[PDB]
Amino acid sequence: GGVPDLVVEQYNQTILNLTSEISTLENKSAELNYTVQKLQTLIDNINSTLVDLKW
């Protein structure tokens, strides 16, 4: 018998980096919400154009 040959290889950790993607999605969500606010006013403007004509 003899001393065992024990080997544990070096671990090389890949980091998952989603910071840019997270920020991008937060920004896109904010842009869409602002657009919703602007579109509500535009919809009201269109609705105001209905005519009430008499002949």
């Binding site: 018998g1 003899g2 001393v3 065992p4 024990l6 080997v7 544990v8 290889e9 070096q10 671990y11 950790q13 890949t14 980091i15 998952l16 980096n17 989603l18 910071t19 993607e21 997270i22 999605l25 937060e26 896109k28 969500s29 904010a30 869409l32 919400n33 657009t35 919703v36 579109l39 509500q40 535009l42 919809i43 269109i46 609705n47 154009t49 209905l50 005519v51 004509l53 002949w55």
Partner: protein
Amino acid sequence: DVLQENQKILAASFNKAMTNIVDAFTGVNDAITQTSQALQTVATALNKIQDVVNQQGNSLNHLTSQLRQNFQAISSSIQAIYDRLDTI
């Protein structure tokens, strides 16, 4: 009178069109709201995933270090055992 009749037709068509255009933009706006919320939800999910996946990466890294140290200890201990057996 064709002018008055045509004006009546055009006014009715314009009002029906605008009513439906208002309703359609309102539905589109609801869709945009739902999409905005969904994108926030995806951002939150990605943040959670990044958190847990890198914690598990850290854990693997640290476990590999602990294991290397434990096996080095075992190697040294068994070496001393075999040296004493050789002396005996």
